[PDB]
């Protein structure tokens, strides 16, 4: 696709049959989702934005389908105000900025 | 150009004859620069991100060149972790996300 930036670039993502809407975010190193109890080992982590840091759980090798594209990688879970697809997964699906 | 996302999308911008590095950030509605002096009036403003809300100074109709592409719009200045080019100016330079 080509996604313009007049509005927030929100897309539908699937994680294990739970389907949520996430922001395609070139400003984010990592991918961060709100509220979900996903499987496997997790490690505490602190991630920073405007305003300061939040504590999240880091899960590795997690499948996520983004607009029909298969992504697998590190997913952080914590009290993010919006779900965010970061560069770790944007790269996997071939996403670029173009102007 | 086309910018891939294996690394942070940091580009050189020119504002007030000053060169700075800024992050092309599709996750930001607005453009936020680290503390600097800009002319004209400004309006106090509050914005939020992953770790809450900050105070910034809002300057309107400010010219900025991003990778040579000219924009004129709103620029917020305050305690951002990094200089951030947001959707308000990304749209002006014709920037889209593509995959």
């Amino acid at each position: 696709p080509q996604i313009t930036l007049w509005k927030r670039p929100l897309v539908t993502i699937r994680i294990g049959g739970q389907l949520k809407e996430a922001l395609l975010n070139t400003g984010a190193d990592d991918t961060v989702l709100e509220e979900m109890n996903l499987p496997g080992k997790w490690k505490p982590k602190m991630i920073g934005g405007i305003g300061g840091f939040i504590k999240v759980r880091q899960y590795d090798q997690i499948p996520i389908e983004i607009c029909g594209h298969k992504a697998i990688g590190t997913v952080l879970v914590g009290p993010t105000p919006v779900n965010i697809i970061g560069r770790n997964l944007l790269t996997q699906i071939g996403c670029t900025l173009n102007f | 150009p086309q910018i891939t996302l294996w690394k942070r999308p940091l580009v050189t911008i020119r504002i007030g004859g000053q060169l700075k590095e800024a992050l092309l950030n599709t996750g930001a509605d607005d453009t936020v620069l680290e503390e600097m002096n800009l002319p004209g009036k400004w309006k106090p403003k509050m914005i939020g991100g992953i770790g809450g809300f900050i105070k910034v100074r809002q300057y309107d109709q400010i010219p900025i060149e991003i990778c040579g592409h000219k924009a004129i719009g709103t620029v917020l200045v305050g305690p951002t972790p990094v200089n951030i080019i947001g959707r308000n100016l990304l749209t002006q330079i014709g920037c889209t996300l593509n995959f």
Binding site: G27, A28, D29, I50 | D29, G49
Partner: peptide
């Protein structure tokens, strides 16, 4: 007024 920069 929402800016989701994230430094992991």
């Amino acid at each position: 007024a929402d800016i989701f920069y994230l430094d992991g």
